[PDB]
Amino acid sequence: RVNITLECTECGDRNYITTKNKRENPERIELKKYCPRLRRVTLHRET
Amino acid sequence: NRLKDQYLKEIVPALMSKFNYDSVMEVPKIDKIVINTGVGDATANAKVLDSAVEELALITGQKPVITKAKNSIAGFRLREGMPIGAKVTLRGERMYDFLDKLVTVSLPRVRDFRGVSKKAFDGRGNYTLGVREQLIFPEIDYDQVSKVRGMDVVIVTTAKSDEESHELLTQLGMP
Amino acid sequence: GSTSNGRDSESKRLGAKRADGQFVTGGSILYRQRGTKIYPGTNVGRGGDDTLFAKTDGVVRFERMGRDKKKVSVYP
């Protein structure tokens, strides 16, 4: 496992940290999370 | 169709007379038929499995179901998860059609017909027949067969005792 | 000579934190446990690590549900 930072695709803010397995998920994870700056849900992508 | 009509017309009075049931509902009737292949050689070539699938889907006419292991056996070079057999169930009129085909053009067309062992009942009222060679099928040609996979033909009825099951089974052709 | 033993964990201070018939204020912890050794009753909640807590003000009552089990309730 490794540590991961998730970045908002509309602001560039780095709002979330999480983990993943690099062998099972070699791509960049995308999740829809709340963005505190815009105060709405936005797609977040691994840096 | 024809077998069901004949049964409901004759065997119901015949059974209600031969055993003296208080109500007609007590009459033992066929319930369902299960055809199980069984394939313990799947961990080397998986074409045996889907093979068994198509000859089942021809002999019965409907998609079988892949069954997998409930545990792991080192001796049979297995671990849990191997698809290790296929099965089919039959109910209703199509069951009667399969029964008629088996009793006319399949069981008589076997290599020999020395009856059916009357002591093979489970002790409750159900019966099991074991087909050894797959080529005995009417609609299936052995030229497209890779192995003689036997079939468990399980016949289940609502007969409380083996006696009534034997009555019904012998009444319908092959004893 | 050596023992090869000698380790233990810190005690976690489990058990009943309030008494039967005692007046209690909302949010108070009533019981600490592993598993549901005691179940939540009326006006009583179950925490994420199985802690039982009061949701209102009232008096604590330890009670017996069906033969083999227990619960605790809070009544105003």
Next chain:
Amino acid sequence: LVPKRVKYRREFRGNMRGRAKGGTEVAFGEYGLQAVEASWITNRQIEAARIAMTRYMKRGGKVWIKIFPHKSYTSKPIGVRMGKGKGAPEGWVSPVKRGKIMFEIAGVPEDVAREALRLAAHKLPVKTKIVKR
């Protein structure tokens, strides 16, 4: 007499307060040895008593041993100090409380039975008596 396996290799020594929980009556044979006091009884003592009382009867009749050495005890050699963990197991013992019947015999007359039990009781570290069903 040794147990085939044990769950733990070390065990507390325990105590011997009170009268024996069960086994205070003759249940299989006609004659028995009863403990009047409490004592640890090892498997060497059991074996010696059994051989004496069986040899006197010339392999006639039947003998039942009503106690088993379930417990183990440990020890430390000469020259070692205190500490550094528990010692190594040595033998197996049965704690016997007062009132326990520990040997029963059958199949022989009064004289043979009583003399065999007298011969056996001299091999044991506990004070005994002879009882009849």
Next chain:
Amino acid sequence: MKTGIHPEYRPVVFVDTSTDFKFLSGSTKSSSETIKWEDGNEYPLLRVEISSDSHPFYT
């Protein structure tokens, strides 16, 4: 009854080659033949060996 998925089987008529025994039952193959027996309907024909009518054990 899988909607469309299930394989297609049709009512077909079997004809014995020994005593010309005629039977009707479902079959997964129609053998690409035609008959006009069983007035009111038509079913395909199939040529096979002796059926239970001409069986040594059934006779």
Next chain:
Amino acid sequence: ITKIDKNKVRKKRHARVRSKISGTESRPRLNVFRSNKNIYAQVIDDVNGVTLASASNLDKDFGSAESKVDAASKVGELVAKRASEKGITSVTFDRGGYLYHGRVKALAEAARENGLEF
């Protein structure tokens, strides 16, 4: 071969449903029974163990009988009207272990259209 009892497994599912849903005086529960012929509805609170309203596909009037489904809608209409007459306005629907698919769904929707608030 033992024949399964439909009512026993239905009651098992009903207990699973009742693990969460319970009727109070302010918010009574609406329970539904479906037989081979008719459909029944009760409105009940569990605090006192008393039912407060009821309707059935067996009353003398309202004889519209077309495929057991519009009958279910009629029963829902009746039970909603009676519950409103008694002052019941908010309820929790108890499907009684049945799937939310056919007659049950029609009954619930017909009750929704009238003075009931699921």
Next chain:
RNA sequence: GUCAUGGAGGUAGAGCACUGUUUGGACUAGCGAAUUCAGAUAAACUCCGAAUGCCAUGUACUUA
């Protein structure tokens, strides 16, 4: 502090319902696994289970 009332909690004892250890028969898949009959044993066994101690309530009595 005592009295009355209500609780949480598995020790002493006991027991064999689970888990380990274990004796004598009957029967036995094959000298010998299981089933049963009778009889034992336990800090890390429990179908049971105290006395005490503990936490509260009281408007009871006394006391600081």
Next chain:
RNA sequence: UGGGGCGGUCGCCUCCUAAAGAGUAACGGAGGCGCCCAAAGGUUCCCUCAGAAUGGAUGGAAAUCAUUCGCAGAGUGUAAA
């Protein structure tokens, strides 16, 4: 640290000791951890395990199928409770 040295140990979790609340020592008796999972998380709907007897081709004590008995004798990522 039952003189010091040699050997062993040093933080966290679970059981016994621990004397039926909580807490409780010894170079006392036993074991684990320094992670894993993109589902092995959330929710909605559905259902039930181990083993045994019997009946049946390859198949054999045990692989898949059918009936009956079966309160958990299974499972619960991993040590124990």
Next chain:
RNA sequence: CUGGUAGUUAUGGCGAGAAGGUCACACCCGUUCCCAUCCCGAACACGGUAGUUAAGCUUCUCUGCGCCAAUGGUAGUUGGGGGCUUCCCCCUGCGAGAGUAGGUCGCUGCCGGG
């Protein structure tokens, strides 16, 4: 009287023996339709009611199993006092577990129909 739905530590369960009815309930018949099967209208869903109490269901009778359970005695034990201290004894209060006399084939509530 019956159908639905609750409460109550199985004294309510398991087992055995019988009676009853399409008023309700169920089995049963069918798959056009909504929906469904890792396959199967078996279940789920829907559309009706020829036959039936064979089963579920309801009612009645059994202590065989299970469950509940005294009284007396005994073990243990707070406090007080002694021995000859692997432990034991005496006085006062509390008081099991096992075993037994005995109990049990349920008891209460609301609603709709006969």
